[PDB]
């Protein structure tokens, strides 16, 4: 008897499904929008990417079989840093590189049996797409959400461009994890995402997202209870307003500090102090923003010779000016609480200012004298009627008290900063603005879009050296101001890649509209995404920016929903056993030579055998005569441990790869691609094929019609197991518990073998085989479709999803 052979059959069914267009989505839909994060065409796809994309295909096939109108699209996040950095590493032009990668990616996806509605394909680096990035940018400008500002920004020396706050990971560039980000002062473009901070925070509650992702966004937004407190100046009419997120420490404010540029610094300066103060103010203006915001420099300042009254204690406190207080932040003035702010502590210690504790540390009380500030929450003390109140709650109590007495007002702030979107790079969407010498910054008219990216052919030309490559192309920027008509200069910076990906899911609903980013009617019929699948690494990047874009577009009246992804599933990373290098073992201690330690990226030069076991590593004898340390590591190019689709599928097969991935572990967890896994997929698929082939002849001469109630013995038992399996598989699929759905099919397959030990091929058995192939389709579509055609005329896409028999479940 012949055995399962994936070789010719897979290509056959792949073409069949495409020609039939089973996965084509209607312009207007029950519907299911199954979306996976489109890739950066920066390289070849490996099984890691395929875990993400196979998961989407499984769900899309299942939903399509159930009769839902399914939208399952694919596209290319082809603009920005990912694509350009990769292309430039190999001295290749970004456009050539991108399209070659897209070609390869499409093949990798097709070879795995993944089906998309390719008629909705989008390529962000194309004018047909980015002209709408510009359209959206213009709307944000008009709505007060896009502005230009000068200030300190993050800068990656390797990328040679500024980066948004979300693109800085552990102080490192999101693309160059080995390069620390630097600070610079430049005038850039920002998207006022903070205007939506409260809604972004509040709307997380109804989302069917992993709690871990919600927590990351909440912490990134960082809402804080603060207050603006008023301090009366002795002998003067003015009451100095100060901003603080620690209103709970008010009774501990022993002095005030005004920014050198604050108007009151010179105005309140005593006559005999004016000279010294004026000298300090001028010296402060000579410093740069960076120098002023320095965090480890010496403490300097001058006593103005004026006093203020602490509104809570009614006590007199000195007023100083010091360059560590920034004029552009808050009110440009602060109340200093040395006992609970380390910077204030050091300033107070240096200039002999009072230090008063008002927040006591739970457990062991703070010592006297205080050697450093206590900045964590505690219990209020020496705070009048507030004594005994827990810090955080105390903030609210003090704010209410201040407002009631007219001594200040509550002020909520967010750690979240506005989104820096301009980049000094060539490969990206040109910002649709013009700079006129007379009018200032003027927007390009909507009807003039798109502002085409100049077609530069010299790669050395495109390479970023510090300024935007466009700054060297007058044929591009020299233009006329749309307002006055005189000579003007087009903006030379481009939009970051995340602008493109913040709404691509909406473009899929109307990929060819050349009058609007999309028609509200079409978008509203498909939105929101019912199930989004993608990596957690996007928690405060794409998964935050998108929510912002959608809320904005909703406010524009183009989108009914306010949340783009109703369901989100973050898939665990696929890992691969990776060789890190030789080691030497002596007793229970493993010595790691520098090269090996460096590749492992750990500070230990020595590990116990237990440490090796615990980190999931093992020592394997190597032909070089030494022991090497191997450990599963995230599958990626940089690691050189990628398992590419083309080669694997050629030597093994798509269903083998799909089962290996899907059965390895719960999808939310990480998994290690292994030979044992591959062999296990082979064993399972061979076992399915063998069961059907063994009974093929009898099955062909058997009818599938029978009366459930009339079944008895093993026949009745099989019918029950069949429906129990259908229930388990259906529910598991709906919850994306793909590994247990497969385990259920493996279990039922065992029941089929057991059944045949006692019973011949029967109508109920034929029906069990029919349902089995249907339930198998989402997972191993090629084999299921192949076996299905041995007995039936239509495709598995046309037979639908098996109907569950509730009664069969009883007892
Ligand atoms: C939605 C946009 C911002 C996504 C962006 N283009 C992007 O993240 N692209 S990507 O780097 O090509 O990744 C695409 C998805 O594949 C997932 N992925 C990569 N490597 C993986 C491994 N080793 N295991 C599992 N999943 C992997 C990545 O998380 C993205 O979801
Ligand atoms: Zn970088
Ligand atoms: Zn003008």
PDB file of C-alpha atoms in Angstrom, residues 438-692:
ATOM      1  CA  UNK A 438       6.707  85.152   3.949  1.00  0.00           C
ATOM      2  CA  UNK A 439       3.828  82.878   4.989  1.00  0.00           C
ATOM      3  CA  UNK A 440       5.791  80.416   7.108  1.00  0.00           C
ATOM      4  CA  UNK A 441       4.646  76.780   7.066  1.00  0.00           C
ATOM      5  CA  UNK A 442       1.936  76.186   4.454  1.00  0.00           C
ATOM      6  CA  UNK A 443       0.121  72.905   3.626  1.00  0.00           C
ATOM      7  CA  UNK A 444       0.139  71.474   0.113  1.00  0.00           C
ATOM      8  CA  UNK A 445      -3.393  71.556  -1.335  1.00  0.00           C
ATOM      9  CA  UNK A 446      -5.295  68.258  -1.154  1.00  0.00           C
ATOM     10  CA  UNK A 447      -5.799  68.251  -4.932  1.00  0.00           C
ATOM     11  CA  UNK A 448      -2.031  68.392  -5.513  1.00  0.00           C
ATOM     12  CA  UNK A 449      -1.375  65.100  -3.738  1.00  0.00           C
ATOM     13  CA  UNK A 450       0.648  63.093  -3.944  1.00  0.00           C
ATOM     14  CA  UNK A 451       3.904  64.897  -3.327  1.00  0.00           C
ATOM     15  CA  UNK A 452       5.986  62.263  -5.092  1.00  0.00           C
ATOM     16  CA  UNK A 453       9.238  61.086  -3.561  1.00  0.00           C
ATOM     17  CA  UNK A 454      12.023  62.096  -5.980  1.00  0.00           C
ATOM     18  CA  UNK A 455      13.336  59.141  -7.980  1.00  0.00           C
ATOM     19  CA  UNK A 456      16.964  58.930  -6.866  1.00  0.00           C
ATOM     20  CA  UNK A 457      18.985  56.153  -8.474  1.00  0.00           C
ATOM     21  CA  UNK A 458      22.373  56.540  -6.799  1.00  0.00           C
ATOM     22  CA  UNK A 459      22.466  54.405  -3.651  1.00  0.00           C
ATOM     23  CA  UNK A 460      25.384  56.398  -2.229  1.00  0.00           C
ATOM     24  CA  UNK A 461      23.107  59.409  -2.693  1.00  0.00           C
ATOM     25  CA  UNK A 462      20.289  57.905  -0.624  1.00  0.00           C
ATOM     26  CA  UNK A 463      22.602  56.866   2.213  1.00  0.00           C
ATOM     27  CA  UNK A 464      21.818  59.009   5.306  1.00  0.00           C
ATOM     28  CA  UNK A 465      24.693  61.176   6.567  1.00  0.00           C
ATOM     29  CA  UNK A 466      22.894  63.342   9.118  1.00  0.00           C
ATOM     30  CA  UNK A 467      20.458  65.393   7.066  1.00  0.00           C
ATOM     31  CA  UNK A 468      17.612  64.208   4.873  1.00  0.00           C
ATOM     32  CA  UNK A 469      18.940  63.005   1.502  1.00  0.00           C
ATOM     33  CA  UNK A 470      16.288  65.261  -0.045  1.00  0.00           C
ATOM     34  CA  UNK A 471      18.160  68.308   1.279  1.00  0.00           C
ATOM     35  CA  UNK A 472      20.506  67.797  -1.668  1.00  0.00           C
ATOM     36  CA  UNK A 473      17.879  67.880  -4.416  1.00  0.00           C
ATOM     37  CA  UNK A 474      16.668  71.391  -5.380  1.00  0.00           C
ATOM     38  CA  UNK A 475      14.733  69.842  -8.261  1.00  0.00           C
ATOM     39  CA  UNK A 476      12.546  68.426  -5.510  1.00  0.00           C
ATOM     40  CA  UNK A 477      12.221  71.042  -2.777  1.00  0.00           C
ATOM     41  CA  UNK A 478      12.341  74.251  -4.824  1.00  0.00           C
ATOM     42  CA  UNK A 479       8.681  75.087  -5.426  1.00  0.00           C
ATOM     43  CA  UNK A 480       6.175  77.923  -5.085  1.00  0.00           C
ATOM     44  CA  UNK A 481       4.163  78.723  -1.980  1.00  0.00           C
ATOM     45  CA  UNK A 482       0.511  77.686  -2.483  1.00  0.00           C
ATOM     46  CA  UNK A 483      -0.651  80.645  -0.400  1.00  0.00           C
ATOM     47  CA  UNK A 484       1.141  83.772  -1.645  1.00  0.00           C
ATOM     48  CA  UNK A 485       2.640  82.292  -4.809  1.00  0.00           C
ATOM     49  CA  UNK A 486       6.236  83.284  -4.167  1.00  0.00           C
ATOM     50  CA  UNK A 487       9.314  81.003  -3.953  1.00  0.00           C
ATOM     51  CA  UNK A 488       9.136  78.304  -1.278  1.00  0.00           C
ATOM     52  CA  UNK A 489      10.821  75.105  -0.101  1.00  0.00           C
ATOM     53  CA  UNK A 490       9.084  71.735   0.257  1.00  0.00           C
ATOM     54  CA  UNK A 491       9.579  69.978   3.587  1.00  0.00           C
ATOM     55  CA  UNK A 492      12.533  67.608   3.190  1.00  0.00           C
ATOM     56  CA  UNK A 493      11.835  65.110   5.976  1.00  0.00           C
ATOM     57  CA  UNK A 494       9.768  61.945   5.496  1.00  0.00           C
ATOM     58  CA  UNK A 495       7.168  60.124   7.599  1.00  0.00           C
ATOM     59  CA  UNK A 496       8.242  57.249   9.834  1.00  0.00           C
ATOM     60  CA  UNK A 497       7.184  53.726   8.831  1.00  0.00           C
ATOM     61  CA  UNK A 498       4.665  53.530  11.667  1.00  0.00           C
ATOM     62  CA  UNK A 499       2.507  56.215  10.025  1.00  0.00           C
ATOM     63  CA  UNK A 500       1.865  53.834   7.115  1.00  0.00           C
ATOM     64  CA  UNK A 501       1.005  50.872   9.347  1.00  0.00           C
ATOM     65  CA  UNK A 502      -1.347  52.847  11.574  1.00  0.00           C
ATOM     66  CA  UNK A 503      -4.222  52.495   9.100  1.00  0.00           C
ATOM     67  CA  UNK A 504      -3.271  49.820   6.540  1.00  0.00           C
ATOM     68  CA  UNK A 505      -6.032  47.571   7.909  1.00  0.00           C
ATOM     69  CA  UNK A 506      -8.555  50.212   6.782  1.00  0.00           C
ATOM     70  CA  UNK A 507      -7.030  50.440   3.313  1.00  0.00           C
ATOM     71  CA  UNK A 508      -7.610  46.685   2.876  1.00  0.00           C
ATOM     72  CA  UNK A 509     -11.345  47.420   2.973  1.00  0.00           C
ATOM     73  CA  UNK A 510     -11.078  49.620  -0.127  1.00  0.00           C
ATOM     74  CA  UNK A 511      -7.572  49.102  -1.642  1.00  0.00           C
ATOM     75  CA  UNK A 512      -8.253  50.886  -4.921  1.00  0.00           C
ATOM     76  CA  UNK A 513     -10.073  54.068  -3.905  1.00  0.00           C
ATOM     77  CA  UNK A 514      -8.302  56.974  -5.586  1.00  0.00           C
ATOM     78  CA  UNK A 515     -10.475  59.693  -4.045  1.00  0.00           C
ATOM     79  CA  UNK A 516     -10.259  58.824  -0.336  1.00  0.00           C
ATOM     80  CA  UNK A 517      -8.084  56.687   1.955  1.00  0.00           C
ATOM     81  CA  UNK A 518     -11.204  54.525   1.967  1.00  0.00           C
ATOM     82  CA  UNK A 519     -14.995  54.755   1.649  1.00  0.00           C
ATOM     83  CA  UNK A 520     -16.617  54.818   5.123  1.00  0.00           C
ATOM     84  CA  UNK A 521     -19.370  52.474   3.938  1.00  0.00           C
ATOM     85  CA  UNK A 522     -16.896  49.724   3.006  1.00  0.00           C
ATOM     86  CA  UNK A 523     -14.684  50.209   6.053  1.00  0.00           C
ATOM     87  CA  UNK A 524     -17.681  50.163   8.377  1.00  0.00           C
ATOM     88  CA  UNK A 525     -18.958  46.913   6.882  1.00  0.00           C
ATOM     89  CA  UNK A 526     -15.674  45.118   7.630  1.00  0.00           C
ATOM     90  CA  UNK A 527     -14.426  46.823  10.808  1.00  0.00           C
ATOM     91  CA  UNK A 528     -13.477  46.199  13.446  1.00  0.00           C
ATOM     92  CA  UNK A 529     -10.853  43.495  12.980  1.00  0.00           C
ATOM     93  CA  UNK A 530     -12.441  40.517  14.742  1.00  0.00           C
ATOM     94  CA  UNK A 531      -9.118  38.832  15.336  1.00  0.00           C
ATOM     95  CA  UNK A 532      -5.708  40.442  15.030  1.00  0.00           C
ATOM     96  CA  UNK A 533      -2.620  38.231  15.390  1.00  0.00           C
ATOM     97  CA  UNK A 534       0.882  39.629  15.864  1.00  0.00           C
ATOM     98  CA  UNK A 535       3.908  40.003  18.129  1.00  0.00           C
ATOM     99  CA  UNK A 536       3.884  41.632  21.558  1.00  0.00           C
ATOM    100  CA  UNK A 537       6.899  43.714  20.528  1.00  0.00           C
ATOM    101  CA  UNK A 538       4.352  46.185  19.097  1.00  0.00           C
ATOM    102  CA  UNK A 539       2.560  46.866  22.406  1.00  0.00           C
ATOM    103  CA  UNK A 540       3.481  50.573  22.588  1.00  0.00           C
ATOM    104  CA  UNK A 541       4.390  50.992  18.938  1.00  0.00           C
ATOM    105  CA  UNK A 542       1.948  49.867  16.235  1.00  0.00           C
ATOM    106  CA  UNK A 543      -0.719  48.667  18.722  1.00  0.00           C
ATOM    107  CA  UNK A 544      -0.853  52.154  20.256  1.00  0.00           C
ATOM    108  CA  UNK A 545      -0.422  54.314  17.158  1.00  0.00           C
ATOM    109  CA  UNK A 546      -3.215  52.448  15.368  1.00  0.00           C
ATOM    110  CA  UNK A 547      -5.697  53.077  18.154  1.00  0.00           C
ATOM    111  CA  UNK A 548      -4.824  56.777  17.817  1.00  0.00           C
ATOM    112  CA  UNK A 549      -5.321  56.844  14.028  1.00  0.00           C
ATOM    113  CA  UNK A 550      -8.652  55.043  14.318  1.00  0.00           C
ATOM    114  CA  UNK A 551      -9.960  57.376  17.020  1.00  0.00           C
ATOM    115  CA  UNK A 552      -8.926  60.349  14.902  1.00  0.00           C
ATOM    116  CA  UNK A 553     -10.541  58.936  11.763  1.00  0.00           C
ATOM    117  CA  UNK A 554     -13.635  58.205  13.826  1.00  0.00           C
ATOM    118  CA  UNK A 555     -13.731  61.842  14.972  1.00  0.00           C
ATOM    119  CA  UNK A 556     -13.497  62.775  11.287  1.00  0.00           C
ATOM    120  CA  UNK A 557     -16.642  60.712  10.766  1.00  0.00           C
ATOM    121  CA  UNK A 558     -15.055  58.106   8.498  1.00  0.00           C
ATOM    122  CA  UNK A 559     -15.077  55.175  10.900  1.00  0.00           C
ATOM    123  CA  UNK A 560     -17.928  54.014  13.134  1.00  0.00           C
ATOM    124  CA  UNK A 561     -15.786  52.082  15.653  1.00  0.00           C
ATOM    125  CA  UNK A 562     -13.252  53.711  17.989  1.00  0.00           C
ATOM    126  CA  UNK A 563     -11.091  50.608  18.424  1.00  0.00           C
ATOM    127  CA  UNK A 564      -9.614  48.982  15.271  1.00  0.00           C
ATOM    128  CA  UNK A 565      -8.840  45.544  16.688  1.00  0.00           C
ATOM    129  CA  UNK A 566     -11.622  44.069  18.829  1.00  0.00           C
ATOM    130  CA  UNK A 567      -9.670  40.888  19.419  1.00  0.00           C
ATOM    131  CA  UNK A 568      -5.890  40.640  19.688  1.00  0.00           C
ATOM    132  CA  UNK A 569      -3.795  37.528  20.130  1.00  0.00           C
ATOM    133  CA  UNK A 570      -0.047  37.869  20.643  1.00  0.00           C
ATOM    134  CA  UNK A 571       1.690  34.725  19.394  1.00  0.00           C
ATOM    135  CA  UNK A 572       4.760  33.396  21.157  1.00  0.00           C
ATOM    136  CA  UNK A 573       8.042  33.431  19.252  1.00  0.00           C
ATOM    137  CA  UNK A 574       9.305  30.408  17.363  1.00  0.00           C
ATOM    138  CA  UNK A 575      12.747  29.475  18.669  1.00  0.00           C
ATOM    139  CA  UNK A 576      15.458  27.267  17.141  1.00  0.00           C
ATOM    140  CA  UNK A 577      18.282  25.350  18.807  1.00  0.00           C
ATOM    141  CA  UNK A 578      21.306  27.614  18.314  1.00  0.00           C
ATOM    142  CA  UNK A 579      25.024  26.921  18.793  1.00  0.00           C
ATOM    143  CA  UNK A 580      26.659  29.599  20.934  1.00  0.00           C
ATOM    144  CA  UNK A 581      30.175  28.194  20.997  1.00  0.00           C
ATOM    145  CA  UNK A 582      32.639  26.096  23.010  1.00  0.00           C
ATOM    146  CA  UNK A 583      32.802  25.945  26.789  1.00  0.00           C
ATOM    147  CA  UNK A 584      34.930  24.043  29.305  1.00  0.00           C
ATOM    148  CA  UNK A 585      33.479  22.000  32.140  1.00  0.00           C
ATOM    149  CA  UNK A 586      35.157  21.395  35.484  1.00  0.00           C
ATOM    150  CA  UNK A 587      33.019  19.809  38.166  1.00  0.00           C
ATOM    151  CA  UNK A 588      29.675  21.606  38.384  1.00  0.00           C
ATOM    152  CA  UNK A 589      31.104  24.777  36.808  1.00  0.00           C
ATOM    153  CA  UNK A 590      30.995  25.641  33.111  1.00  0.00           C
ATOM    154  CA  UNK A 591      33.543  28.243  31.964  1.00  0.00           C
ATOM    155  CA  UNK A 592      32.503  30.456  29.050  1.00  0.00           C
ATOM    156  CA  UNK A 593      35.236  31.894  26.822  1.00  0.00           C
ATOM    157  CA  UNK A 594      34.685  35.523  25.775  1.00  0.00           C
ATOM    158  CA  UNK A 595      33.349  34.758  22.275  1.00  0.00           C
ATOM    159  CA  UNK A 596      30.796  32.293  23.654  1.00  0.00           C
ATOM    160  CA  UNK A 597      29.739  34.588  26.506  1.00  0.00           C
ATOM    161  CA  UNK A 598      29.358  37.519  24.130  1.00  0.00           C
ATOM    162  CA  UNK A 599      27.160  35.554  21.715  1.00  0.00           C
ATOM    163  CA  UNK A 600      24.978  34.450  24.655  1.00  0.00           C
ATOM    164  CA  UNK A 601      24.774  38.095  25.710  1.00  0.00           C
ATOM    165  CA  UNK A 602      25.092  37.387  29.440  1.00  0.00           C
ATOM    166  CA  UNK A 603      27.517  38.839  32.024  1.00  0.00           C
ATOM    167  CA  UNK A 604      28.486  35.440  33.478  1.00  0.00           C
ATOM    168  CA  UNK A 605      31.871  33.960  32.560  1.00  0.00           C
ATOM    169  CA  UNK A 606      30.934  30.932  34.639  1.00  0.00           C
ATOM    170  CA  UNK A 607      27.697  28.959  34.919  1.00  0.00           C
ATOM    171  CA  UNK A 608      26.808  25.939  37.021  1.00  0.00           C
ATOM    172  CA  UNK A 609      25.380  22.927  35.205  1.00  0.00           C
ATOM    173  CA  UNK A 610      22.133  23.807  36.947  1.00  0.00           C
ATOM    174  CA  UNK A 611      22.214  27.318  35.440  1.00  0.00           C
ATOM    175  CA  UNK A 612      22.698  25.794  31.987  1.00  0.00           C
ATOM    176  CA  UNK A 613      19.737  23.458  32.534  1.00  0.00           C
ATOM    177  CA  UNK A 614      17.561  26.256  33.895  1.00  0.00           C
ATOM    178  CA  UNK A 615      18.116  28.577  30.928  1.00  0.00           C
ATOM    179  CA  UNK A 616      17.059  25.718  28.652  1.00  0.00           C
ATOM    180  CA  UNK A 617      20.535  25.059  27.282  1.00  0.00           C
ATOM    181  CA  UNK A 618      22.568  21.885  26.901  1.00  0.00           C
ATOM    182  CA  UNK A 619      26.163  20.952  26.145  1.00  0.00           C
ATOM    183  CA  UNK A 620      26.777  18.909  22.991  1.00  0.00           C
ATOM    184  CA  UNK A 621      30.036  17.195  21.972  1.00  0.00           C
ATOM    185  CA  UNK A 622      31.425  18.857  18.836  1.00  0.00           C
ATOM    186  CA  UNK A 623      33.717  17.447  16.152  1.00  0.00           C
ATOM    187  CA  UNK A 624      36.278  20.126  17.027  1.00  0.00           C
ATOM    188  CA  UNK A 625      36.935  18.049  20.139  1.00  0.00           C
ATOM    189  CA  UNK A 626      35.173  20.419  22.533  1.00  0.00           C
ATOM    190  CA  UNK A 627      31.774  20.811  24.174  1.00  0.00           C
ATOM    191  CA  UNK A 628      29.506  23.505  22.757  1.00  0.00           C
ATOM    192  CA  UNK A 629      26.640  25.254  24.493  1.00  0.00           C
ATOM    193  CA  UNK A 630      23.373  25.070  22.542  1.00  0.00           C
ATOM    194  CA  UNK A 631      20.196  26.873  23.480  1.00  0.00           C
ATOM    195  CA  UNK A 632      16.886  27.704  21.807  1.00  0.00           C
ATOM    196  CA  UNK A 633      17.021  31.298  20.532  1.00  0.00           C
ATOM    197  CA  UNK A 634      14.428  33.417  18.720  1.00  0.00           C
ATOM    198  CA  UNK A 635      14.363  32.383  15.076  1.00  0.00           C
ATOM    199  CA  UNK A 636      15.752  35.286  13.057  1.00  0.00           C
ATOM    200  CA  UNK A 637      18.239  36.321  10.366  1.00  0.00           C
ATOM    201  CA  UNK A 638      20.629  38.037  12.771  1.00  0.00           C
ATOM    202  CA  UNK A 639      20.870  34.730  14.641  1.00  0.00           C
ATOM    203  CA  UNK A 640      21.406  32.661  11.505  1.00  0.00           C
ATOM    204  CA  UNK A 641      19.032  30.019  12.890  1.00  0.00           C
ATOM    205  CA  UNK A 642      16.178  30.629  10.483  1.00  0.00           C
ATOM    206  CA  UNK A 643      14.315  27.726   8.913  1.00  0.00           C
ATOM    207  CA  UNK A 644      13.292  29.012   5.489  1.00  0.00           C
ATOM    208  CA  UNK A 645      10.057  27.913   3.827  1.00  0.00           C
ATOM    209  CA  UNK A 646      11.316  27.163   0.323  1.00  0.00           C
ATOM    210  CA  UNK A 647      13.976  24.586   1.329  1.00  0.00           C
ATOM    211  CA  UNK A 648      11.901  23.002   4.065  1.00  0.00           C
ATOM    212  CA  UNK A 649       8.783  22.559   1.941  1.00  0.00           C
ATOM    213  CA  UNK A 650      10.822  21.171  -0.944  1.00  0.00           C
ATOM    214  CA  UNK A 651      12.449  18.497   1.227  1.00  0.00           C
ATOM    215  CA  UNK A 652       9.456  17.933   3.535  1.00  0.00           C
ATOM    216  CA  UNK A 653       6.135  19.660   2.891  1.00  0.00           C
ATOM    217  CA  UNK A 654       3.689  22.410   3.838  1.00  0.00           C
ATOM    218  CA  UNK A 655       1.263  20.338   5.930  1.00  0.00           C
ATOM    219  CA  UNK A 656       4.247  18.878   7.783  1.00  0.00           C
ATOM    220  CA  UNK A 657       5.459  22.395   8.602  1.00  0.00           C
ATOM    221  CA  UNK A 658       1.960  23.600   9.539  1.00  0.00           C
ATOM    222  CA  UNK A 659       1.359  20.684  11.915  1.00  0.00           C
ATOM    223  CA  UNK A 660       4.861  21.061  13.391  1.00  0.00           C
ATOM    224  CA  UNK A 661       4.073  24.682  14.205  1.00  0.00           C
ATOM    225  CA  UNK A 662       0.466  24.269  15.345  1.00  0.00           C
ATOM    226  CA  UNK A 663       0.965  21.233  17.581  1.00  0.00           C
ATOM    227  CA  UNK A 664       4.195  22.373  19.253  1.00  0.00           C
ATOM    228  CA  UNK A 665       2.576  24.294  22.121  1.00  0.00           C
ATOM    229  CA  UNK A 666      -0.212  26.748  22.907  1.00  0.00           C
ATOM    230  CA  UNK A 667       0.154  29.526  20.315  1.00  0.00           C
ATOM    231  CA  UNK A 668       0.517  32.248  22.972  1.00  0.00           C
ATOM    232  CA  UNK A 669       3.632  30.473  24.245  1.00  0.00           C
ATOM    233  CA  UNK A 670       7.038  30.240  22.642  1.00  0.00           C
ATOM    234  CA  UNK A 671       7.905  27.023  20.843  1.00  0.00           C
ATOM    235  CA  UNK A 672      11.095  25.427  19.647  1.00  0.00           C
ATOM    236  CA  UNK A 673      11.228  24.218  16.069  1.00  0.00           C
ATOM    237  CA  UNK A 674      12.666  20.683  16.350  1.00  0.00           C
ATOM    238  CA  UNK A 675      13.378  17.550  14.343  1.00  0.00           C
ATOM    239  CA  UNK A 676      11.197  15.621  16.818  1.00  0.00           C
ATOM    240  CA  UNK A 677       8.355  17.985  15.993  1.00  0.00           C
ATOM    241  CA  UNK A 678       8.802  17.486  12.266  1.00  0.00           C
ATOM    242  CA  UNK A 679       8.909  13.710  12.714  1.00  0.00           C
ATOM    243  CA  UNK A 680       5.765  13.909  14.827  1.00  0.00           C
ATOM    244  CA  UNK A 681       3.940  15.789  12.046  1.00  0.00           C
ATOM    245  CA  UNK A 682       5.064  13.137   9.557  1.00  0.00           C
ATOM    246  CA  UNK A 683       3.836  10.326  11.818  1.00  0.00           C
ATOM    247  CA  UNK A 684       0.435  11.985  12.227  1.00  0.00           C
ATOM    248  CA  UNK A 685      -0.143  12.751   8.535  1.00  0.00           C
ATOM    249  CA  UNK A 686       1.056   9.253   7.525  1.00  0.00           C
ATOM    250  CA  UNK A 687      -1.382   7.746  10.031  1.00  0.00           C
ATOM    251  CA  UNK A 688      -4.303   9.740   8.588  1.00  0.00           C
ATOM    252  CA  UNK A 689      -3.435   8.751   5.025  1.00  0.00           C
ATOM    253  CA  UNK A 690      -2.988   5.071   5.933  1.00  0.00           C
ATOM    254  CA  UNK A 691      -6.397   4.864   7.644  1.00  0.00           C
ATOM    255  CA  UNK A 692      -8.245   6.242   4.618  1.00  0.00           C
TER     256      UNK A 692
END
